[PDB]
Amino acid sequence: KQKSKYIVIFGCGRLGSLIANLASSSGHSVVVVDKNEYAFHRLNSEFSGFTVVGDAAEFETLKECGMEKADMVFAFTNDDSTNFFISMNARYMFNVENVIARVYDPEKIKIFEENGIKTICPAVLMIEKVKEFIIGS
Amino acid sequence: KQKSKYIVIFGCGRLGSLIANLASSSGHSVVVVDKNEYAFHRLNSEFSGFTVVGDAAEFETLKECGMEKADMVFAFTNDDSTNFFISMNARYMFNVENVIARVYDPEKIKIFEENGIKTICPAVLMIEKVKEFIIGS
Numbered sequence: 001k002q003k004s005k006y007i008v009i010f011g012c013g014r015l016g017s018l019i020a021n022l023a024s025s026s027g028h029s030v031v032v033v034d035k036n037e038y039a040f041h042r043l044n045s046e047f048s049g050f051t052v053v054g055d056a057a058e059f060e061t062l063k064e065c066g067m068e069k070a071d072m073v074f075a076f077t078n079d080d081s082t083n084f085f086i087s088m089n090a091r092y093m094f095n096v097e098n099v100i101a102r103v104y105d106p107e108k109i110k111i112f113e114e115n116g117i118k119t120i121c122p123a124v125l126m127i128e129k130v131k132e133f134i135i136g137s
Numbered sequence: 138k139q140k141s142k143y144i145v146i147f148g149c150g151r152l153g154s155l156i157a158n159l160a161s162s163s164g165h166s167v168v169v170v171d172k173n174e175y176a177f178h179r180l181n182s183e184f185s186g187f188t189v190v191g192d193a194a195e196f197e198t199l200k201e202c203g204m205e206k207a208d209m210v211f212a213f214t215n216d217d218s219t220n221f222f223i224s225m226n227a228r229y230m231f232n233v234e235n236v237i238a239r240v241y242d243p244e245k246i247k248i249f250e251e252n253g254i255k256t257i258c259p260a261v262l263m264i265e266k267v268k269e270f271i272i273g274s
């Protein structure tokens with residue numbers, strides 16, 4: 001399950017595969033999207049869910065994911081512009097409330113957050129954790 | 138500063154250089170250690186502080202850092218065994234209270250933490266942040 005959610009993850013790399021594998025083992029319905037079919041070898045033997053090969057910077061790829069049914073969308077490619085494209089479409093075309101994007105450039109965080117997209121910026125996250133260990137929290 | 142601390146950072150890569158540059162701009166005394174002299178090109182023009190070339194898996198390198206004077210030691214190489222060596226020496230040979238290590242393998246976190254070493258494990262940190270965005274926290 002009654003708690004099962006519909007989750008779309010773009011990017012089946014190091015980050016995306018980790019989240020996909022965990023989401024699947026938690027009982028969610030998971031769609032994982034990558035431009036490179038070989039990326040899917042990171043999904044483990046237990047992964048239940050569906051794969052989609054396509055370039056997520058193309059609207060037609062976004063249409064093939066059933067994103068209007070999604071509870072959450074994760075924009076986890078290695079390109080900030082692509083993740084912005086995915087996340088803006090998720091929010092506004094497909095009306096997804098919970099959208100999380102990876103953002104490498106800290107200066108790009110603001111434009112995502114002003115559009116209601118939650119951000120994971122590795123540099124910021126590491127600095128925040130160091131600060132907690134020095135100054136408290 | 139009167140607030141200036143003595144900070145030793147091992148590994149001048151992507152993570153270490155970011156912390157070194159920020160520490161220096163905050164007014165701290167910073168020693169940065171790397172086996173590869175070319176790594177120091179990541180330090181910015183404003184960086185004040187000292188560099189040490191050496192293999193941090195060798196005790197003689199650890200002796201050249203004045204670690205018994207350190208307020209904090211950051212074990213930020215790309216090798217978990219090396220970071221354990223550095224951190225254990227920092228804690229117990231050089232009596233540093235505040236020691237932070239990067240740990241890639243989540244299964245290795247426990248042995249660091251049982252020895253009073255704070256850990257930054259990228260995979261764990263990313264999963265924790267995703268969880269906060271879904272479940273709150």
Ligand SMILES: Nc1ncnc2c1ncn2[C@@H]1O[C@H](COP(=O)(O)O)[C@@H](O)[C@H]1O
Nearest residue numbers: 011013014015034035039055056077078
């Ligand atoms: N335009 C795109 N559409 C879909 N997947 C992409 C796109 N650009 C990059 N990726 C994927 O994002 C992933 C990034 O991997 P990593 O840096 O390990 O998280 C790789 O598997 C890439 O093939």
Ligand SMILES: Nc1ncnc2c1ncn2[C@@H]1O[C@H](COP(=O)(O)O)[C@@H](O)[C@H]1O
Nearest residue numbers: 148150151152171172176192193214215
């Ligand atoms: N045994 C070691 N002693 C000192 N520096 C090291 C050692 N092993 C790796 N490193 C450095 O740690 C850094 C890791 O870089 P990065 O993966 O970008 O954080 C590099 O600049 C390496 O040369």
Ligand code: NA
Nearest residue numbers: 111114115116
């Ligand atoms: Na807007």
Ligand code: NA
Nearest residue numbers: 248251252253
């Ligand atoms: Na011990």
